[PDB]
Design a protein around this ligand. Structure first.
Ligand SMILES: [Ca+2]
Ligand SMILES: [Ca+2]
Length: 128
């Protein structure tokens, strides 16, 4: 698998890099600021093969469920995917989705749709 930090190699839309809550990997995590249309886009996810991939998000969410649209290569492939609470802003949980990606370089973008977002540490991409 390959781990891609949320805070580096990404384009942020109404979302900022923060370090307030400890336990993140790399240099920080991404805090989504807007309830709708905050986004993190990974511009350079690089895969060995075309097929189903496990994308495992490491994130924190004190309480409640926050839903995100998920796009792969500009196309929306998940609609309001639920991210459930970890219990505390310094409890970093994991959520794994299964999505199709191509071999070579891909984009992945996650977007708030009404419930804002979890604080997003990183993703790890492995072949399913
Ligand atoms: Ca936020
Ligand atoms: Ca991070």
């Amino acid at each position: 698998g390959t781990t891609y930090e949320a805070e580096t190699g990404t384009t942020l839309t109404d979302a900022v890099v923060e370090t307030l809550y400890p336990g993140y990997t790399g240099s920080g995590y991404v805090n989504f600021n807007a309830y709708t249309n905050s986004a993190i886009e990974w511009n350079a996810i690089n895969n060995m093969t075309t097929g189903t991939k496990n994308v495992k998000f490491r994130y924190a969410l004190e309480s409640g469920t926050r839903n995100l649209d998920i796009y792969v290569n500009g196309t929306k492939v998940l609609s309001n995917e639920p991210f459930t609470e970890t219990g505390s802003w310094s409890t970093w949980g994991e959520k794994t989705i299964q999505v199709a990606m191509n071999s070579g370089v891909n984009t992945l973008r996650i977007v708030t749709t009404g419930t804002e977002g979890p604080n997003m540490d990183n993703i790890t991409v492995t072949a399913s």
